[PDB]
Design an enzyme around this catalytic site. Structure first.
Site, PDB file in Angstrom:
ATOM      1  CG  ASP A   1      -1.890   1.227   1.024  1.00  4.82           C
ATOM      2  OD1 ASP A   1      -1.652   1.662   0.093  1.00  4.82           O
ATOM      3  OD2 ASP A   1      -2.737   1.461   2.236  1.00  4.82           O
TER       4      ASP A   1
ATOM      5  CB  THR B   1      -2.429   6.203   2.116  1.00  2.00           C
ATOM      6  OG1 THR B   1      -2.117   6.932   1.613  1.00  2.00           O
ATOM      7  CG2 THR B   1      -2.340   7.030   3.683  1.00  2.00           C
TER       8      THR B   1
HETATM    9  N1  LIG Z   1     -13.168  15.068   4.691  1.00  2.00           N
HETATM   10  C1  LIG Z   1     -13.396  14.938   3.078  1.00  2.00           C
HETATM   11  N2  LIG Z   1     -14.525  15.213   1.754  1.00  2.00           N
HETATM   12  C2  LIG Z   1     -14.166  15.431   0.674  1.00  2.00           C
HETATM   13  N3  LIG Z   1     -12.975  14.880   0.230  1.00  2.00           N
HETATM   14  C3  LIG Z   1     -12.237  13.790   1.173  1.00  2.00           C
HETATM   15  C4  LIG Z   1     -11.848  14.248   1.985  1.00  2.00           C
HETATM   16  N4  LIG Z   1     -11.063  13.721   3.181  1.00  2.00           N
HETATM   17  C5  LIG Z   1     -10.509  12.898   2.099  1.00  2.00           C
HETATM   18  N5  LIG Z   1     -11.379  13.355   0.932  1.00  2.00           N
HETATM   19  C6  LIG Z   1     -10.927  12.909  -0.520  1.00  2.00           C
HETATM   20  O1  LIG Z   1     -11.710  11.200  -0.671  1.00  2.00           O
HETATM   21  C7  LIG Z   1     -10.709  10.875  -1.018  1.00  2.00           C
HETATM   22  C8  LIG Z   1     -10.491   9.112  -1.805  1.00  2.00           C
HETATM   23  O2  LIG Z   1     -11.203   8.755  -0.447  1.00  2.00           O
HETATM   24  P1  LIG Z   1     -10.905   9.185   1.069  1.00  2.00           P
HETATM   25  O3  LIG Z   1     -11.692  10.148   1.936  1.00  2.00           O
HETATM   26  O4  LIG Z   1     -11.355   7.758   1.347  1.00  2.00           O
HETATM   27  O5  LIG Z   1      -9.183   9.121   1.298  1.00  2.00           O
HETATM   28  P2  LIG Z   1      -8.213   8.169   1.062  1.00  2.00           P
HETATM   29  O6  LIG Z   1      -8.138   6.264   1.594  1.00  2.00           O
HETATM   30  O7  LIG Z   1      -7.481   8.039  -0.702  1.00  2.00           O
HETATM   31  C9  LIG Z   1      -6.034   8.367   1.530  1.00  2.00           C
HETATM   32  P3  LIG Z   1      -5.085   8.615   0.339  1.00  2.00           P
HETATM   33  O8  LIG Z   1      -5.503   9.580  -0.537  1.00  2.00           O
HETATM   34  O9  LIG Z   1      -3.641   9.282   0.893  1.00  2.00           O
HETATM   35  O10 LIG Z   1      -4.733   7.333  -0.083  1.00  2.00           O
HETATM   36  C10 LIG Z   1      -9.500  11.563  -1.355  1.00  2.00           C
HETATM   37  O11 LIG Z   1      -8.423  11.598  -1.972  1.00  2.00           O
HETATM   38  C11 LIG Z   1      -9.369  12.797  -0.616  1.00  2.00           C
HETATM   39  O12 LIG Z   1      -8.862  14.122  -1.660  1.00  2.00           O
HETATM   40 MG   LIG Z   2      -3.324   2.731   3.777  1.00  2.00          MG
END
Ligand SMILES: Nc1ncnc2c1ncn2[C@@H]1O[C@H](COP(=O)(O)OP(=O)(O)CP(=O)(O)O)[C@@H](O)[C@H]1O
Ligand SMILES: [Mg+2]
Ligand SMILES: CCCCC/C=C/C/C=C\C/C=C\C/C=C\CCCC(=O)O[C@H](COC(=O)CCCCCCCCCCCCCCCCC)COP(=O)(O)O[C@@H]1[C@H](O)[C@@H](O)[C@H](OP(=O)(O)O)[C@@H](O)[C@H]1O
Ligand SMILES: *[C@@H]1O[C@H](CO)[C@@H](O[C@@H]2O[C@H](CO)[C@@H](O[C@@H]3O[C@H](CO)[C@@H](O)[C@H](O[C@@H]4O[C@H](CO)[C@@H](O)[C@H](O)[C@@H]4O)[C@@H]3O)[C@H](O)[C@H]2NC(C)=O)[C@H](O)[C@H]1NC(C)=O
Ligand SMILES: *[C@@H]1O[C@H](CO)[C@@H](O[C@@H]2O[C@H](CO)[C@@H](O)[C@H](O)[C@H]2NC(C)=O)[C@H](O)[C@H]1NC(C)=O
Ligand SMILES: *[C@@H]1O[C@H](CO)[C@@H](O[C@@H]2O[C@H](CO)[C@@H](O)[C@H](O)[C@H]2NC(C)=O)[C@H](O)[C@H]1NC(C)=O
Lengths: 1064, 350
Positions: free
Chosen positions: A379, A381
């Site tokens: 992974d 992140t």
């Molecule tokens: N409070 C929030 N409100 C709206 N969008 C959000 C948010 N927090 C994160 N996001 C966006 O959601 C997208 C993907 O969904 P998520 O929130 O689960 O992040 P993620 O699981 O991809 C962590 P990473 O980007 O580090 O891999 C992210 O790229 C982010 O820009």
């Molecule tokens: Mg992760």
């Protein structure tokens, strides 16, 4: 109906519900044998030896004592039993440490909560759980410290969801706040039966007069955790193993390795050769009994019935040769693997200092597999990055701001639309004076930073305020506003207080409503009411969702922000767009009625609420964008390069877009500046098929040189991956993935990583390694072969379900290079030696059938042969399988190519198995002929012309056999530690000291009546000390010469590396 | 509360050790030393085995293939002898029978040199597998120790020869039944100006045998001889004909199970004086037929050796080991001389 009284522990005890004790032990002091015996007699060697000892009960058949096989069987059985009991006691220790915790139960006589233990809690008790501490059992809430009766539970144990759930009490029973008035409530709770469906509850709590309904909106499971509340009042309805979550607990299936299958094949081969030897011996016996029936008349043989004689001879040879399958192996290899698992979590180089978490190996049945892994589904992140966020850049009103401006583009070029970098000082200079037009947008941004979030601040005695954020990016946005000048302080329910350091006055904003985060929305919307009396909507979300829902005629700076999202996406920094809109009261009163439309439908909340909110997010005005950076962990650029050098194809799964993944791959030294990227970004399924066909036919038509076979990588997106895993199309992706060196999947759905793992593992012969973090990819670990869980801040869910718990990604460089090569090299040699030491001894019983008229006469004693497997040949195996290092760990990480030796299967194969077997056969025949040539007529003694007998020769055979086995062990060892001298020569000295004592003491007790006077005929005879020197060297010279030849003239990679280690 | 693993030499797998190197400089000296220490031992062993001067006469078929009125020459097929000097007169034999058809074989041989060492006389029996499973363990030890074991308490190993005609058999055992009963003259009768040579008949078995074989305490109306003892002990056992297994040492010698069908059994010995040269004659009561076991009996007269008696297996094994060592050492030496390895570098053969 589960009728549950409220305030009498004697009334509900008449039903006889379960107690609160959790049982995690496998065995018990009451029912131990009926289960342990059935568990142990389930493999192959155990049942075989049981049948052998059962057959060895017929008279005039057993060639040795009646208890020569049951002794070793009972010894290994009690060893397994004591090990199981030790593990059961170690589990029960933590069991009692977790069960003896404190809990507060109400008392009717005391009229107050008394402190007691967890195990004393019964169904129907009224409990009071204190500040942020977890719920002890399945309780229905009666009241709480919050004014309406709400609480916040955390469901990271019963789900994978990271948000907090609002569980509220009914308003018709939340008026019982004080402890002294708890006695005046009477009624029953008609509850449901125990289930395992978590999100569904049905009950009926009757109060003093009438009934109220119950629902899973006031049901708190055991794995939850109270948060943001001082105390609650709960009513225990399910306890112990009757809860919703711990009812039908999951069971880890038996995870088998390839070494187990090779062992099974070797055991089948041993059984076949055993059958062959028994058949040959019985044929010889019957033909010699039929051919020479006239000369063998002094034995008074049967002759008149040979049908039973043949079967009796078969049984006799079976009992004599059943020791060819050493039962000691199934215990020796198990203890070696257990020690190896113990020696992994005892290394400081696999221990994290910043978190105090060493390596925790939960399963020791998959330790050698660390030496034969080809794919790693890692992974991004949490695993590659440090999982920490830091506010780096913002872009608002078409500008862009950083504090540390670099000098490559400090000059804003003014190429029409402004692109470049300016300081935060000019941000504050355009923030201070109110005369600028952009300053209402700058402040609406800077309030959206400090108000739109859901962070709960808290003060400390030092004054440094700590923020409690459900996501680390929002917490870094709040700390970025705090150190920029807009500190966020005390948050009470339904208002937000902000300390403004520009003027010095502390403002406040009335929070009207917030809509929760959803992965389908990828948005977060929050309507607010201001000191102005005006209603404004704040909305944050990704650039791919909200840019469709703007009024492009109103704002004039969208192209600047999209280019700032373009140079932000060129650095891999995650970004979020911030939008706002003034709304009026009449539309807010209607969207409030739409929210009470969604408040009416508790049955449907995923479909109703989120798109009922999107009725009012039809149009917004963009303020700008923010940029939160995620620092990469240490050592990762070196570990990934070292793993790729060894020839391990890595699959990196990033949950972002294509360009961000490409950037983070180029920065992580995963790819290169010349690596061919086979980009596959198509939407139509037929178009994806055509693209795959074009790629494969462009790749197969031309040859692949040495530089072309190494410089290949694959980059796929989420939709292409989802369309390329169909049962009719996955073969193309599989055959195109085996050619590249690094795979980069982008925008991968959480429930598809396990699908990719199961697809790769079902149509290949390689072993996988699934490393990740958080409960979002737990299915990737419970389905792969060797699972790894990094102890991080996203929740300790993966660490408790992974086979190996590792602190960070840096440690894998030592987990798969050293603790994989060693764990695959030691067990193979140990098993081969365990087979060889048994076959080299228990084969003279077969070579002797040419001299005793094929009668099946034991050459050695009965108890000495049994002791051979317990007190003489159980220490060299442990030393060569645990305390031996064929190459130093310092000169192993430098040359990772050695891992290929374990990646193919060169040190463990059936060919080497047959080689060791035939070597043991050769040694057995050699010692047999060398002894029968010396003990010709038995006249080999100088003690007044006395002769030898049948036992003074078997003792010599046994001693020479053990000496040769120990010599071979000494020739196999690679490192001469201070623990080897107590195993290989120590066993020889132990035998040489134990034999006279035994032969002088035990025969006087009618146990070993065959050693009367053998001490003088063996030690006093000059033949013993001469054969013990002339035969072992004669048997080991061949192995010595062959080892020298393969070390000198035909070496290999590990040979040259060990040579360089010894000389340098 | 600190979960940090210990830091030492064992918990870190940092124990001191030594790695063996298979360099030719560390292999060739070992092999040449093994050869140089095994050659003198081998030649000494073969020299010690050469000094064994013994004789063996296959006195079988003396009831049919031997003369009666005179001592005819024994065919060279049977006689075997290894002495310091050469044999001048061929060994002869005669068949002499007395009352009740008790046939006997009179052998006559010549010892051409005075033997200084002690003399031992065995009978070698061939193709008589004593190491057979049904034969070695079929004898009771309590009856050997001397106790009145009841019928229901007899050993189950001697099952066929157990309680004959509803009477407890005294020597319940197949070894006691099939006993070699060719009585020797107990003295070598010297012929032509040569005195006799007395021999010791006791103190021939093991010490533990004489210490365990105790005289029985049975009566005479409850024990019966085995079917192979009815001739010498007719009319069953009596108060006087009851044998004493403590003094009857030949029975103790025969109970010791041999190892191979080519074995010896100690019968007579003399360790008090030297055997002078001359012509000797020995009488043997032909009572054990060779047709019962299909082999060939033999009278063997040997001395004693530091290792055994006329056997070079140890010497030839030492010679084989020394030859293999001295061959492979020179082979590897000339191989590294005429064509060295020249492969010390890795050259990136990965
Ligand atoms: N409070 C929030 N409100 C709206 N969008 C959000 C948010 N927090 C994160 N996001 C966006 O959601 C997208 C993907 O969904 P998520 O929130 O689960 O992040 P993620 O699981 O991809 C962590 P990473 O980007 O580090 O891999 C992210 O790229 C982010 O820009
Ligand atoms: Mg992760
Ligand atoms: C009078 C003179 C007497 C001289 C006696 C000499 C005998 C020599 C016999 C054979 C040798 C022939 C040639 C010698 C030359 C080369 C030998 C090649 C050896 C060979 O690679 O395979 C071996 C099998 O080897 C037998 O198991 C040996 C094969 C034996 C087969 C036996 C077949 C049945 C025999 C029964 C006879 C019974 C007869 C009846 C007698 C009883 C009745 C009277 C495999 O096992 P191995 O443990 O050694 O494996 C080696 C070893 O572990 C090490 O060197 C290497 O590790 P590393 O390099 O990384 O450290 C490793 O890679 C591997 O090479
Ligand atoms: C030296 O050792 C020789 C080897 O054992 C032995 O030769 C055997 O001697 C036994 C004992 O006499 C013989 O056994 C007898 O055999 C005849 C048939 O030839 C049987 O009829 C006889 O059973 C009879 O049964 C009658 C009714 O129960 C009873 O009244 C009789 O007394 C008699 O027991 C015996 O079973 C055997 O055939 C001999 N040959 C072999 C090859 O075994 C020599 O006698 C022995 N000599 C001395 C001096 O000890
Ligand atoms: C030592 O040898 C002499 C003869 O060399 C033995 O004397 C003979 O004994 C037997 C026994 O019955 C007599 O039949 C002979 O007549 C004796 N011969 C002579 C010349 O005396 C003497 O018995 C032997 N010693 C022992 C202890 O047996
Ligand atoms: C070993 O043999 C010698 C030589 O025959 C025996 O010595 C003779 O013993 C007899 C016993 O009666 C004497 O009559 C002779 O005079 C002895 N010979 C000489 C030359 O003195 C000796 O007894 C034998 N050892 C035994 C039987 O244990």
């Amino acid at each position: 109906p589960r009728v549950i009284h409220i305030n009498d522990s004697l009334a509900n005890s008449s039903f006889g519900y379960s107690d609160n004790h959790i049982s995690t032990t496998k065995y018990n002091f009451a029912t131990f044998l009926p289960k342990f015996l059935f568990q142990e007699f389930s493999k192959y060697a155990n049942l075989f030896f049981l049948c052998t000892s059962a057959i060895q009960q017929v008279p005039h058949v057993s060639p040795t004592n009646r208890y020569t096989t049951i002794g070793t069987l009972l010894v290994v059985l009690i060893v397994s039993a004591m090990k199981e009991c030790i593990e059961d006691i170690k589990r029960a220790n933590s069991d009692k440490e977790l069960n003896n915790s404190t809990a507060e139960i109400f008392s009717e006589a005391h009229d107050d909560f008394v402190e007691k233990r967890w195990i004393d809690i019964r169904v129907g008790d009224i409990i009071r759980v204190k500040s942020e501490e977890p719920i002890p059992a399945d309780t229905i809430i009666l009241s709480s410290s919050e004014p309406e009766g709400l609480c916040y539970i955390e469901t990271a144990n019963l789900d994978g969801e990271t948000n907090l759930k609002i569980k509220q009490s009914r308003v018709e029973t939340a008026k019982f706040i004080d402890v002294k008035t708890l006695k005046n409530m009477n009624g029953k709770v008609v509850s449901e039966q125990p289930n395992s469906s978590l999100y569904t509850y049905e009950g009926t709590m009757t109060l003093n007069d009438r009934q109220i309904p119950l629902s899973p909106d006031q049901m708190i499971l055991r794995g939850a955790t109270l948060r943001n509340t001082a105390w609650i009042f709960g009513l225990v309805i399910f306890t112990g193993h009757e809860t919703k979550l711990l009812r039908n607990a999951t069971a880890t299936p038996i995870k088998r390795t390839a070494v187990e299958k090779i062992i099974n094949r070797q055991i089948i081969a041993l059984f076949t050769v055993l059958i062959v030897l028994i058949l040959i011996s019985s044929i010889g016996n019957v033909i010699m009994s039929t051919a020479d029936a006239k000369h063998l008349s002094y034995l008074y043989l049967e002759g008149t019935n040979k049908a039973g004689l043949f079967f009796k001879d078969f049984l006799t040879f079976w009992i004599l040769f059943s020791n060819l399958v050493p039962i000691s192996l199934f215990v020796t290899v198990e203890l070696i693997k257990y020690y190896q698992a113990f020696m992994i979590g005892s290394d400081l180089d696999l221990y994290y200092e910043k978190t105090d978490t060493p390596t925790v190996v939960r399963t020791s049945s998959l330790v050698e597999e660390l030496g034969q892994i080809e794919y790693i589904f890692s992974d991004k992140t949490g695993t590659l990055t440090r999982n920490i966020m830091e506010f780096k850049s913002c872009s608002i009103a078409g500008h862009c701001y950083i504090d540390k401006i670099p000098e490559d583009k400090t000059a804003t070029v003014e190429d029409g639309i402004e692109v470049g970098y300016r300081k935060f000082d000019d941000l504050k200079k355009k923030l201070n004076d109110p005369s600028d037009e952009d300053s209402p947008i700058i402040n609406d941004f800077l309030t959206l930073l400090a108000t739109c979030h859901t962070v709960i601040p808290e003060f400390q005695s030092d004054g440094s305020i700590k923020y409690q954020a459900a996501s680390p990016d929002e917490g870094a946005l709040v700390q970025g506003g705090a150190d920029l000048g807009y500190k966020f302080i005390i948050r009470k329910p339904n208002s937000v207080t902000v300390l403004l350091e520009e003027t010095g006055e502390e403002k406040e904003y009335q929070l009207l409503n917030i809509c929760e985060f959803n992965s389908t929305r990828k948005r977060m919307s929050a309507i607010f009411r201001f000191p102005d009396g005006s209603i404004k909507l704040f909305c944050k979300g990704a650039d791919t969702v909200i840019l469709e829902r703007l009024d492009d005629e109103a704002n004039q700076y969208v192209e600047a922000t999209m280019r700032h999202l373009e140079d932000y996406a060129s650095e891999g920094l995650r970004t979020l767009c911030l939008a706002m809109r003034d709304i009026s009261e009449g539309e807010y009163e209607e969207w409030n009625s739409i929210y009470n439309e969604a408040a009416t439908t508790l049955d449907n909340r995923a479909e109703k609420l989120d798109e009922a909110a999107n009725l009012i997010e039809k149009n917004l005005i963009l303020i700008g964008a923010t940029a939160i950076e995620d620092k990469l962990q240490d050592g990762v650029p070196e570990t990934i390069h070292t793993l790729q050098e060894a020839g391990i194809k890595i699959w990196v799964l990033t949950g972002d877009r294509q360009e961000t993944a490409i950037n983070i791959g180029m920065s992580c030294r995963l790819l290169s500046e010349d690596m061919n990227l086979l980009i596959i970004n198509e939407e139509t399924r037929d178009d994806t098929e055509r693209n795959l066909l074009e790629k494969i036919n462009a790749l197969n038509e031309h040859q692949l040189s040495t530089h072309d076979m190494n410089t290949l990588a694959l980059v796929i997106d989420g939709k292409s991956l989802g369309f390329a895993l169909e049962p009719e199309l996955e073969d193309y992706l599989l055959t195109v993935a085996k050619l590249c060196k690094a795979v980069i999947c982008c925008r991968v759905s959480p429930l598809q990583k396990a699908l990719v793992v199961k697809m790769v593992k079902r149509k290949s012969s390689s072993l996988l390694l699934a490393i990740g973090d958080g409960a979002n990819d737990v299915s990737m670990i419970q389905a792969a072969h060797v699972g790894v869980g990094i102890s991080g801040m996203e929740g300790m869910q993966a660490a408790r379900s992974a086979d190996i718990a590792v602190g960070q990604f840096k440690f894998l460089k030592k987990l798969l290079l050293v603790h994989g090569s060693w764990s695959y090299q030691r067990i193979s040699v140990a098993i081969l030696y365990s087979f060889y030491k048994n076959t080299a001894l228990y084969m003279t019983q077969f070579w002797y059938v040419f001299a005793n008229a094929f009668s099946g006469q034991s050459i050695m004693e009965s108890w000495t042969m049994s002791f051979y497997n317990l007190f003489f040949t159980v220490w060299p195996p442990f030393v060569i399988g645990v305390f031996d290092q064929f190459v130093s760990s310092r000169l192993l990480e430098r040359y990772p190519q050695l891992y290929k030796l374990g990646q193919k299967g060169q040190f463990f194969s059936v060919y080497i198995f047959w080689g060791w077997i035939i070597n043991g056969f050769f040694h057995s025949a050699i010692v047999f002929i060398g002894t029968i040539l010396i003990y010709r007529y038995g006249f080999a003694l100088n003690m007044h012309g006395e002769l030898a007998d049948h036992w003074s020769w078997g003792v010599t055979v046994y001693t020479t056999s053990v000496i040769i086995v120990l010599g071979k062990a000494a020739l196999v060892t690679n490192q001469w530690t201070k623990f080897t001298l107590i195993a290989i020569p120590g066993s020889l000295l132990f035998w040489l000291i134990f034999f006279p004592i035994y032969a002088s003491i035990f025969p006087h007790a009618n146990i070993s009546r065959e050693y009367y006077g053998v001490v003088k005929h063996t030690y006093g005879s000059g033949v013993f000390w001469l054969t013990l020197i002339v035969l072992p060297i004669f048997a080991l010279v061949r192995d010595f010469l062959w080892k020298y030849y393969k070390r000198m003239y035909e070496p290999e990679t590990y040979h040259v590396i060990q040579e360089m280690q010894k000389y340098n | 509360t600190s979960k940090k693993p210990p830091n030492t030499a064992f918990r870190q797998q940092r124990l001191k050790a030594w790695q063996p190197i298979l360099s030719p400089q560390s292999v060739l000296p070992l092999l040449i030393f093994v050869a140089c220490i095994f050659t003198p031992i081998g030649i000494g062993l073969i020299v010690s085995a050469t000094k064994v001067q013994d004789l063996t006469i296959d006195y079988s078929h003396c009831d049919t293939k031997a003369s009666t009125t005179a001592f005819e020459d024994i065919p060279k097929k049977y006689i075997k002898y290894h002495f310091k000097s050469k044999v001048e007169n061929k060994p002869q034999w005669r068949l002499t029978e007395n009352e009740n058809g008790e046939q006997s074989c009179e052998l006559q041989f010549e010892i051409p040199n005075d033997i200084k060492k002690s003399i031992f006389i065995y009978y070698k029996i061939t193709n008589f597998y004593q190491n057979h499973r049904r034969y070695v363990q079929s004898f009771d030890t309590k009856q050997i120790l001397g106790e009145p074991i009841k019928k229901d308490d007899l050993d189950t190993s001697c099952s066929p020869i157990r309680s004959r005609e509803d009477k407890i058999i005294y020597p319940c055992g197949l070894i006691a039944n099939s006993m070699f009963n060719d009585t020797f003259s107990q003295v070598l009768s010297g012929i032509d100006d040569t005195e006799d040579y007395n021999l010791t008949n006791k103190h021939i078995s093991w010490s533990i045998d004489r210490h365990r074989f105790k005289t029985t305490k049975y009566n005479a109306s409850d024990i019966v001889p085995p079917p192979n003892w009815m001739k010498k002990y007719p009319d069953g056992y009596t108060d006087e004909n009851l044998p004493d297994i403590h003094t009857w040492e030949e029975f103790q010698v025969w109970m010791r199970t041999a190892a191979f069908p080519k074995f010896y059994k100690l019968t007579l010995k003399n360790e008090s004086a030297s055997l002078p040269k001359g012509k000797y004659q020995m009488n043997i009561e032909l009572n054990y037929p060779i047709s019962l076991f299909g082999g060939t009996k033999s009278f063997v007269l040997t001395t004693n050796g530091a290792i055994g008696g006329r056997n070079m297996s140890l010497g030839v094994l030492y010679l084989i080991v020394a030859g293999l060592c001295a061959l492979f050492g020179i082979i590897f030496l000339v191989k590294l001389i005429f064509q060295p390895r020249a492969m010390g570098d890795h050259t990136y053969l990965n």
